[PDB]
Amino acid sequence: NSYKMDYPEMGLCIIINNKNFHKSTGMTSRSGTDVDAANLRETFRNLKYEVRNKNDLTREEIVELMRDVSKEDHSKRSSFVCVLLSHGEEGIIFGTNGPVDLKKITNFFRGDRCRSLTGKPKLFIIQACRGTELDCGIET
Amino acid sequence: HKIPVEADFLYAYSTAPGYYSWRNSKDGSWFIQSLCAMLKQYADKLEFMHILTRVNRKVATEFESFSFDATFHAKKQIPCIVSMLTKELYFY
């Protein structure tokens, strides 16, 4: 019923905190995201997760980073967590220099490409826009 | 004995498909800020899907955008939990 959570380690928590975007992207600076990144670092350290904070990576560094973490040996760890903080669109997260498909990042951890993470929960926490629609709300 | 390669992933999205996501420039985004607040209160008490449900409630009820531009004023947000998990997840 419950995942095995009592491996020697809880696992990595990679936070990718993208705040400042190249002019070519037309994206504005993400004021406040440093508070999110500090908050998540303390929250997940407190869940006994091993936190790597990474700031202002390009789309290429992102996928290089994710490829590398997927090639690590996670046998002694219970789960895996990735937090993306950036601009985005439906299925797309923004590196500092442009867009990259979410599938590109998550395919690295698929059950057959990261065999040390097979049968273990893969957490992806995405703070990013998914389009340009506005929820007007309904009053209670 | 095979499992799907897409099994055991979980996607915690700040907002619903097709929608903006709102951020406060001093205290952080509504989602991360609600998610840390719920994870600090309930990680030793509730299964992760129920912590995420409380994050949905908090973001949906406690947050509303402010804009001088009326097109972007008084707007709301609901996060979106996307679960391919095959089991329950507890942090204790």
Binding site: - | W22, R23, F66
Partner: peptide, 5 residues
């Protein structure tokens, strides 16, 4: 003043 991602 709220900002969009």
């Amino acid at each position: 003043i709220t900002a969009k991602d």
